Amino acid sequence: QPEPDMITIFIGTWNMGNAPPPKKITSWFLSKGQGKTRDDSADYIPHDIYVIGTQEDPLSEKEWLEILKHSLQEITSVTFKTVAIHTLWNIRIVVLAKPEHENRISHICTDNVKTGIANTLGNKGAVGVSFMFNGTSLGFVNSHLTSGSEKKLRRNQNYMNILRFLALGDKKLSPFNITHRFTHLFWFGDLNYRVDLPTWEAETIIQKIKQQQYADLLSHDQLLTERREQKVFLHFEEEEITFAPTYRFERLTRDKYAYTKQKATGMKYNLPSWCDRVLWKSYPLVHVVCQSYGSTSDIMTSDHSPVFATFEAGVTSQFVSKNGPGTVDSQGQIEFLRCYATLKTKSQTKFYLEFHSSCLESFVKSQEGENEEGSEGELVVKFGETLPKLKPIISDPEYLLDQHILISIKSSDSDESYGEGCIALRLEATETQLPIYTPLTHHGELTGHFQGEIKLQTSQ
Numbered sequence: 001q002p003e004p005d006m007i008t009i010f011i012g013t014w015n016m017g018n019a020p021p022p023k024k025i026t027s028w029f030l031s032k033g034q035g036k037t038r039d040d041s042a043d044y045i046p047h048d049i050y051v052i053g054t055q056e057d058p059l060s061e062k063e064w065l066e067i068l069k070h071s072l073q074e075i076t077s078v079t080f081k082t083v084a085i086h087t088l089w090n091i092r093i094v095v096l097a098k099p100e101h102e103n104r105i106s107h108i109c110t111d112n113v114k115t116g117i118a119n120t121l122g123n124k125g126a127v128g129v130s131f132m133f134n135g136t137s138l139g140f141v142n143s144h145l146t147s148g149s150e151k152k153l154r155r156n157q158n159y160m161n162i163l164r165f166l167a168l169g170d171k172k173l174s175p176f177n178i179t180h181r182f183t184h185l186f187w188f189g190d191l192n193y194r195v196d197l198p199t200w201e202a203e204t205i206i207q208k209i210k211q212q213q214y215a216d217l218l219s220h221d222q223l224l225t226e227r228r229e230q231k232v233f234l235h236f237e238e239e240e241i242t243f244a245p246t247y248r249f250e251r252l253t254r255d256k257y258a259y260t261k262q263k264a265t266g267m268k269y270n271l272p273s274w275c276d277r278v279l280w281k282s283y284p285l286v287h288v289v290c291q292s293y294g295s296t297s298d299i300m301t302s303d304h305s306p307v308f309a310t311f312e313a314g315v316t317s318q319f320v321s322k323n324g325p326g327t328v329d330s331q332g333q334i335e336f337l338r339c340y341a342t343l344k345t346k347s348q349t350k351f352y353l354e355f356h357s358s359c360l361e362s363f364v365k366s367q368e369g370e371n372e373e374g375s376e377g378e379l380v381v382k383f384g385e386t387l388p389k390l391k392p393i394i395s396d397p398e399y400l401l402d403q404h405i406l407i408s409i410k411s412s413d414s415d416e417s418y419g420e421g422c423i424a425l426r427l428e429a430t431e432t433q434l435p436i437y438t439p440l441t442h443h444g445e446l447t448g449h450f451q452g453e454i455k456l457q458t459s460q
Ligand SMILES: O[C@@H]1CCN(Cc2ccc(Cl)cc2)C1
Pocket: 224, 225, 227, 228, 236, 237
């Protein structure tokens, strides 16, 4: 049986509004309703992995697992295995996978982050799962962020706290947060960003939704506008939204949006909004294609509609040679030429680089670079030709071209990272000097750039 080079992943996010689900939720897992839907001809074909995020979930883990497994069985006639389940308060993540994948999946991690202090620590935060699928790392985050049209800043703070403090993936990647630890990172949930228009425009917004004219509404979506201004989800992708706002509906129909202020809302308006979202971040030049992104029309127990997204995701095999793992393959090397970091920091310390990759036996510290002043005020850290020669464990190009090098630039004084980035080894040529580039981030904020040239030698 050949190892896969592609899998499909189902991502679901549903704020259940503290109500039991109805008896049939199969439309969700079939990506049927509004938006980018899945072709009918695929209905009997199981996804490899199903990741279900819920918020305001009133069910026990046992109750929800039984509904999910029975749903997938009815659709596909496959009995899915449970990879992971993690619940913080009423926020839950379930990872199910085809039985054939049991022995491909390892290094299963779960964590949660609680957002807010005293007042605002009580019910919002995130849960997550990570694991290895053969040679590919996969991360999944389900977040319920702060509610309310006037709290978009709070939501961006909740996001930053979750990405800094969620402990998933390989703990040896100590300078790297979850936005660098995975080949593919899926981040979904009730992100609670709103359509930011005047309250007086509510009936006009509803009119626009009934005409399926979302363009004027999406131009005021806080997640898109905050993303555009690099305030949140920097370097993440989202598929185009072509489904109606998934919030806030009257229960037991989808014909009415309940937007008017009520005691039960703290006297806040809930203008129709795309609260419920799926975003992703994959390492450079890895295959990732969104094949569906939409909302169900027929599940009406909650004031939110379920959202589905499906993805084709590139995976690699667990490579073994005569040499690595357990030694270097002296036929392979990675060289860096004319490298310099540009940092936004106003500090003056010396900096050095760390290279981390599963293609290395362990991480590699460089010598200190030479600080110069950029023409526009920037700190430029010059490495020239001084960066070490990296010795991959395997030189076979079918392995090595599929790998990535994570880079941290660290202060000599404190050993704290000032920036993290990622370089693909999927080069246009081997044994050829080729430009490389990564933005650098720290706590998910842009802190600079790394650029130069690479020269990769494989056994070919
Ligand atoms: O090529 C990808 C696709 C677009 N990305 C840049 C971008 C990110 C967020 C927004 Cl809102 C708009 C544009 C980079």
